[PDB]
Amino acid sequence: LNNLQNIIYNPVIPFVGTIPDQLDPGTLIVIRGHVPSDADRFQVDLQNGSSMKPRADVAFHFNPRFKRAGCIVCNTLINEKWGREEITYDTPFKREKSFEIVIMVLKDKFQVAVNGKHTLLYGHRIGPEKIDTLGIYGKVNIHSIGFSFSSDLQST
Ligand SMILES: C=CC(=O)[C@H](CO[C@@H]1O[C@H](CO)[C@H](O)[C@H](OS(=O)(=O)O)[C@H]1O)NC(C)=O
């Protein structure tokens, strides 16, 4: 409900960048982009740091996959080992279609909407205060990355 504040337009992919502010409850991450016609998958990762080796922990891996029926895989990476996947089969992403992802950080979970329709929840596995880095990888065109805040949904 606050005005969007974009940090970057048209970032080169893979993108890695520092998040300006701590992801307190009510924070919104807003990502606009387009799925190329040949995309197999892309991901948005909320990371504890940016190291590639040992690979930084990923508090929240949000991973649309386009083969077969399509799905979104969510998971957490700790010390270079993935945990148990949570798979959402009702996916709104399609090759050759554009999207607006809104990741809402709540007290107990992430709530993700795409094109304004609720898509999935992911309970926190590590504290969101450990997140300082946003990564975007794979086959995706990103138009903008920005941050907002909602006091309404801040406590729910
Ligand atoms: C098709 C592959 C598999 O199931 C496993 C798990 O596949 C991983 O699944 C994770 C989410 O659980 C990440 O998506 C990850 O991708 S990564 O580039 O972020 O590291 C991806 O390989 N793969 C193996 C045994 O080799």
Numbering used by the authors: 5 to 160
Reproduce passages from the article:
The small 3-O-sulfated galactose head group of sulfatides, an abundant glycosphingolipid class, poses the (sphinx-like) riddle on involvement of glycan bridging by tissue lectins (sugar code). As an attractive possibility, the concept of the sugar code considers the glycan part of glycosphingolipids as a biochemical message anchored in the membrane, and thereby presented on its surface ready for being ‘read’ by receptors (Gabius and Roth, 2017; Kaltner et al., 2019). Like the glycosphingolipids, known endogenous receptors for their glycan part (lectins) present their own mysteries (Ledeen et al., 2018). Especially the occurrence of diverse types of modular architecture is not yet fully understood in functional terms. As illustrated in the bottom part of Figure 1 for vertebrate galectins, three distinct forms are found (García Caballero et al., 2020; Kaltner et al., 2017).
Respective testing disclosed aggregation also for Gal-8 (bottom, left). The two tandem-repeat-type galectins thus appear to use a compensatory contact for acquiring stability, and here sphingosine's hydroxyl group comes into play as a possibility. A means to test the validity of this hypothesis is crystallographic study, if a complex of a galectin CRD with synthetic sulfatide-1 could be obtained. Clear electron density for the head group structure was obtained, whereas the amide's acyl chain appeared rather mobile, so that a profiling of the head group's contacts became possible. As depicted in Figure 4A on two levels of magnification, the galactose moiety with its sulfate was central to contact building. In this position, sphingosine's hydroxyl group and side chains of Arg69/Glu89, together with a water molecule, are connected by hydrogen bonding. It hereby appears to functionally substitute the 3′-hydroxyl group of the glucose part of lactose. The data obtained by crystallography with the synthetic head group are first evidence that a non-glycan determinant, here sphingosine's hydroxyl group, is involved in sulfatide pairing with a galectin via water-mediated contacts, as the 3-OH group of glucose of the canonical ligand lactose otherwise does by direct hydrogen bonding. Structurally, sulfatide recognition by galectin-8 is shown to involve sphingosine's OH group as substitute for the 3′-hydroxyl of glucose of lactose.
